[PDB]
Amino acid sequence: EMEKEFEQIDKSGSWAAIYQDIRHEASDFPSRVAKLPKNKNRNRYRDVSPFDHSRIKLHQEDNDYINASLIKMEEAQRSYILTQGPLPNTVGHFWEMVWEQKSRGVVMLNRVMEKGSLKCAQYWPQKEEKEMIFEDTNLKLTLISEDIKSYYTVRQLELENLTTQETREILHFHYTTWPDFGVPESPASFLNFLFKVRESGSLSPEHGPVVVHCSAGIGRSGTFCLADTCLLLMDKRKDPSSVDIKKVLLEMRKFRMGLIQTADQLRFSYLAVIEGAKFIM
Numbered sequence: 001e002m003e004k005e006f007e008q009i010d011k012s013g014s015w016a017a018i019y020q021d022i023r024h025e026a027s028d029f030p031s032r033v034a035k036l037p038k039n040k041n042r043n044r045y046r047d048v049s050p051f052d053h054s055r056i057k058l059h060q061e062d063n064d065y066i067n068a069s070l071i072k073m074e075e076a077q078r079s080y081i082l083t084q085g086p087l088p089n090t091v092g093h094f095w096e097m098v099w100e101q102k103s104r105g106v107v108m109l110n111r112v113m114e115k116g117s118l119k120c121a122q123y124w125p126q127k128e129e130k131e132m133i134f135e136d137t138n139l140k141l142t143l144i145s146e147d148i149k150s151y152y153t154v155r156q157l158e159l160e161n162l163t164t165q166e167t168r169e170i171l172h173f174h175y176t177t178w179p180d181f182g183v184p185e186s187p188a189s190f191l192n193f194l195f196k197v198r199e200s201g202s203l204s205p206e207h208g209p210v211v212v213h214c215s216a217g218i219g220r221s222g223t224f225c226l227a228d229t230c231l232l233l234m235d236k237r238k239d240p241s242s243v244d245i246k247k248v249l250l251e252m253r254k255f256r257m258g259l260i261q262t263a264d265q266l267r268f269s270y271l272a273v274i275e276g277a278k279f280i281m
């Protein structure tokens with residue numbers, strides 16, 4: 001059981017060592033499409049690339065590339081698209097991906113500005129009456145409503161395909177209080193946020209996969225998917241303590257490199273799953 005494993009690694013301060021074993025054990029697959037010179041300006045970070053085997057393809061004949069990975073967790077019956085925070089030139093591609101994958105929710109775990117730099121383009125409208133048009137992908141986006149709380153904001157958005165005049169409602173879940181450095185002290189507001197995404201229906205098999213991002217789509221985004229998948233597997237298995245976080249993380253790393261960036265994010269993931277297990281047992 002992980003509670004005991006937590007105390008061990010914590011009391012022995014072995015987090016950096018566990019983290020290094022995960023780094024060593026992690027899969028490495030080709031990412032040839034990401035490294036094509038024509039895709040250089042579609043990537044926020046040159047060292048963060050989707051693997052070719054799990055990458056999301058855009059349905060445009062010209063250039064199908066977006067920095068986005070499908071993470072398929074077979075036993076948990078959960079899928080997630082993990083992506084980078086859009087660039088000024090990829091906002092249209094981002095919403096094209098949301099449209100084409102039939103996603104119901106977008107989960108954002110960063111602020112647009114952190115540490116005095118832009119971590120993400122402003123890719124949604126700030127006011128009801130000022131809609132955004134993406135001329136390159138023929139999509140219109142309208143803010144319908146915005147519910148601002150202490151730790152997170154939920155926004156209802158209408159996405160309209162200008163080519164076919166279909167419209168869908170998208171929910172934008174924006175966790176606004178992840179600190180500039182380190183991890184939250186307590187996982188309580190993160191768990192509350194995760195239960196709110198679940199309650200929306202956004203993670204349900206009726207819909208396309210949820211889109212999850214931070215700046216690179218590997219660190220905070222990683223913590224989100226890992227916590228969700230681990231808690232769901234604890235519901236599903238005869239023996240909930242058979243759930244090994246490290247194994248789940250390694251299975252997720254077959255689909256996108258670098259998920260969980262620091263030993264602190266790993267410790268936080270254990271804490272989130274341990275605490276979430278109380279609200280689930």
Ligand SMILES: c1csc(-c2ncc[nH]2)c1
Pocket residue numbers: 040041042043044045087088089
């Ligand atoms: C790194 C690759 S592209 C890029 C960019 N595009 C627009 C703003 N920053 C930064």
